[PDB]
Design a protein around this ligand. Structure first.
Ligand SMILES: Brc1ccc(-c2nnn[nH]2)cc1
Length: 113
């Protein structure tokens, strides 16, 4: 399937133990996709002061369309040194590894793979 229904745990930035997916735009998109398949991916909502507390390159989920079965359609966009790789809608958050942090909420998404 081109799209997968996922419920992503929303993490507080100060709880996140692993603050990125790796060291290059291609690696972080690769690892983000692997973690999303393995159910080991979290979401941090972007507010003032969040991104400087995480590791570049960043992987965003961005709205790809205006929401089947309550799931917002999203795609991945990476960012390094102020350049984005991908073009998409509003950010829903920044993806990070999930290693057992307690979430504050769940975000239902339909992920384009
Ligand atoms: Br991104 C992403 C998310 C899930 C999957 C997947 N493959 N099989 N089941 N789920 C692949 C890529």
């Amino acid at each position: 399937k081109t799209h997968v229904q996922l419920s992503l745990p929303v993490l507080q930035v100060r709880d996140v133990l692993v603050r990125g997916f790796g060291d290059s735009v291609e690696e972080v998109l690769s690892e983000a996709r692997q973690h999303l398949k393995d159910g080991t991916c979290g979401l941090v909502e972007v507010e003032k002061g969040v991104l400087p507390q995480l590791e570049q390159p960043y992987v965003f989920i961005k709205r790809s369309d205006a929401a089947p079965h309550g799931h917002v359609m999203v795609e991945l966009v990476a960012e390094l040194e102020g350049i984005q790789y991908g073009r998409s809608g509003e950010t829903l958050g920044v993806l990070v590894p999930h290693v057992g942090e307690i979430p504050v909420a769940y975000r239902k998404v339909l992920l384009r793979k």
